[PDB]
Amino acid sequence: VADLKAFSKHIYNAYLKNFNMTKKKARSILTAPFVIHDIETLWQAEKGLVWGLPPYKEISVHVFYRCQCTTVETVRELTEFAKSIPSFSSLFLNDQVTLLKYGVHEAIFAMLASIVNKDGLLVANGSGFVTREFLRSLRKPFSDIIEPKFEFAVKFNALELDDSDLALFIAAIILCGDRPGLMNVPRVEAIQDTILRALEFHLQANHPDAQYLFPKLLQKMADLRQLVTEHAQMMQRIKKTETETSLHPLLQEIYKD
Amino acid sequence: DLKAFSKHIYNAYLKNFNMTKKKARSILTAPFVIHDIETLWQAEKGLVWGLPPYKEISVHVFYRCQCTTVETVRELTEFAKSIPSFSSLFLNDQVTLLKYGVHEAIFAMLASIVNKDGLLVANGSGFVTREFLRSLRKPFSDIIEPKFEFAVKFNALELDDSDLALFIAAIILCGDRPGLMNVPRVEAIQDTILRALEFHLQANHPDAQYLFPKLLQKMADLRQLVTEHAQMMQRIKKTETETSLHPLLQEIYKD
Ligand SMILES: O=C(Nc1ccccc1C(=O)O)c1cccc(S(=O)(=O)N2CCc3ccccc3C2)c1
Numbered sequence: 266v267a268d269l270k271a272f273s274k275h276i277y278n279a280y281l282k283n284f285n286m287t288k289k290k291a292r293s294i295l296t297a298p299f300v301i302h303d304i305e306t307l308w309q310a311e312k313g314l315v316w317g318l319p320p321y322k323e324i325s326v327h328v329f330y331r332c333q334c335t336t337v338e339t340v341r342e343l344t345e346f347a348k349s350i351p352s353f354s355s356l357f358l359n360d361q362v363t364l365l366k367y368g369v370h371e372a373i374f375a376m377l378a379s380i381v382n383k384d385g386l387l388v389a390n391g392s393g394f395v396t397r398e399f400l401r402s403l404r405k406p407f408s409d410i411i412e413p414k415f416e417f418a419v420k421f422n423a424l425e426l427d428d429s430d431l432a433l434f435i436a437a438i439i440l441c442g443d444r445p446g447l448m449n450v451p452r453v454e455a456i457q458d459t460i461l462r463a464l465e466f467h468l469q470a471n472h473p474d475a476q477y478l479f480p481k482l483l484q485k486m487a488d489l490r491q492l493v494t495e496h497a498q499m500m501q502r503i504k505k506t507e508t509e510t511s512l513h514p515l516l517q518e519i520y521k522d
Numbered sequence: 523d524l525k526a527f528s529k530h531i532y533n534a535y536l537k538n539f540n541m542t543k544k545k546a547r548s549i550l551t552a553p554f555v556i557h558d559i560e561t562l563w564q565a566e567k568g569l570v571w572g573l574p575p576y577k578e579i580s581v582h583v584f585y586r587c588q589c590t591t592v593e594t595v596r597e598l599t600e601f602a603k604s605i606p607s608f609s610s611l612f613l614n615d616q617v618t619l620l621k622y623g624v625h626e627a628i629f630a631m632l633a634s635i636v637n638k639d640g641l642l643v644a645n646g647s648g649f650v651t652r653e654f655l656r657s658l659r660k661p662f663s664d665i666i667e668p669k670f671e672f673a674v675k676f677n678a679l680e681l682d683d684s685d686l687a688l689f690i691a692a693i694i695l696c697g698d699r700p701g702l703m704n705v706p707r708v709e710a711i712q713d714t715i716l717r718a719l720e721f722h723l724q725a726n727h728p729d730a731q732y733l734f735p736k737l738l739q740k741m742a743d744l745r746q747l748v749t750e751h752a753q754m755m756q757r758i759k760k761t762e763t764e765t766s767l768h769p770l771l772q773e774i775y776k777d
């Protein structure tokens with residue numbers, strides 16, 4: 266219980282040091298950003314009011330490129346976050362990459378819930394708010410990509426986790442010993458079990474009255490697996506049917522499996 | 523900007539490697555001499571030094587080479603990370619560079635702990651004789667011999683630690699590695715290292731002609747060396763099935 270109070274605080278610092286957008290910062294904004302709800306307001310957002318990119322093609326593809334850019338920026342933040350966990354950094358560099366490779370999207374979808382409400386999501390570091398309605402209005406198969414992440418984000422936010430809960434949840438997602446090609450599995454498993462025990466102790470103190478919060482959270486991790494799988498499946502469809510669209514090499518690398 | 527860069531790398535080098543060429547040369551000019559089974563046994567029992575379960579002598583030496591190789595991969599990983607431009611690459615690119623670079627780097631650094639007669643082991647405490655390494659049974663005797671051949675020809679160039687620092691950095695930040703994600707960037711960093719190395723060789727070795735191009739040729743030689751090493755490790759994995767290879771080395775010899 267004592268080594269676990271310490272551990273949790275250490276991770277919460279790695280979290281606060283490395284992510285530009287916390288749930289605390291986001292909730293206070295969501296309760297002014299510039300609302301992007303159509304082409305005119307998107308054009309206005311670009312021209313200064315909110316914001317290099319691959320050459321212009323069309324609006325649904327443009328949004329698709331901005332999602333990729335945001336995804337990459339978050340992979341960096343997550344990379345720096347993980348490295349800030351001493352036990353992570355003491356793994357072999359090839360194992361670090363394996364964990365990140367299979368972990369990042371699950372983590373990204375987990376953190377998305379922080380910047381989301383029923384109506385849309387905060388973009389460009391809180392400067393803008395893209396409406397969910399506008400994202401459904403994009404042509405197929407681009408409209409299909411973001412919609413399930415929303416569905417998930419609403420159900421997730423109902424658990425009312427704060428940044429210190431998320432810190433440990435994210436760390437658990439990344440330091441997960443079931444990843445294929447993992448070199449030193451027992452070690453990764455050991456570190457995970459510590460994170461999970463820490464998370465669980467932390468949930469008791471931080472949420473005294475919330476029942477079943479820990480097992481519900483574990484189920485959320487299973488859900489994120491299904492989410493990422495379904496994401497990968499859709500990116501295959503874009504790579505095949507939308508050959509004119511281009512995918513950032515780092516995402517190509519991740520989606521490869 | 524190149525005087526600065528070189529000094530920065532020389533610090534990463536001195537901070538990260540336990541055995542420099544200066545430290546080695548002064549020892550090689552007392553370590554405990556391992557030249558046979560009795561002196562190997564004596565070296566183990568305290569006089570010099572977990573491992574995989576005992577099998578036989580040629581395999582034991584083979585396990586100690588693996589252990590040393592792994593420890594150096596760590597030192598090299600920390601060394602490279604100590605280059606800001608390296609650390610600013612994507613983590614998957616860092617791993618690619620290290621994957622294909624380390625063995626070339628290891629064989630380059632080996633020359634520092636080697637003379638005609640043998641090599642310094644266990645952080646300078648011991649000296650294993652070349653003769654004893656030839657005396658090991660096949661295919662284990664074949665593994666180390668070419669690295670020696672290379673190390674003698676290499677030491678003739680009389681490089682100091684500050685030359686090696688930049689040479690190693692060049693070996694690692696090499697943009698010709700397969701599966702490299704951001705090639706132009708890696709190439710840009712390399713060219714800086716190579717320009718630095720070249721400027722540094724003029725100042726550090728005013729009279730040595732053709733030292734820079736000869737060094738470039740040494741990098742091509744190391745490629746051939748590593749290729750031939752990989753080929754031999756395939757033979758041990760296939761014919762010596764009872765022998766075990768460290769998982770990290772299994773990863774590197776794969777592709
Ligand atoms: O909707 C989003 N962003 C935007 C939407 C509209 C306009 C601008 C942006 C932006 O973030 O710049 C948005 C943000 C964060 C996350 C997401 S997502 O739906 O979780 N995302 C992550 C993985 C991924 C990988 C490849 C392609 C698309 C995606 C989609 C969307």
Ligand SMILES: O=C(Nc1ccccc1C(=O)O)c1cccc(S(=O)(=O)N2CCc3ccccc3C2)c1
Binds near residue numbers: 588590632666
């Ligand atoms: O000769 C050496 N080591 C020893 C030999 C005898 C006894 C002890 C040691 C020791 O290093 O402790 C030795 C040291 C450092 C390097 C080398 S090596 O020949 O460059 N080495 C590196 C790659 C590799 C990978 C897998 C298997 C073998 C090898 C061969 C040998």
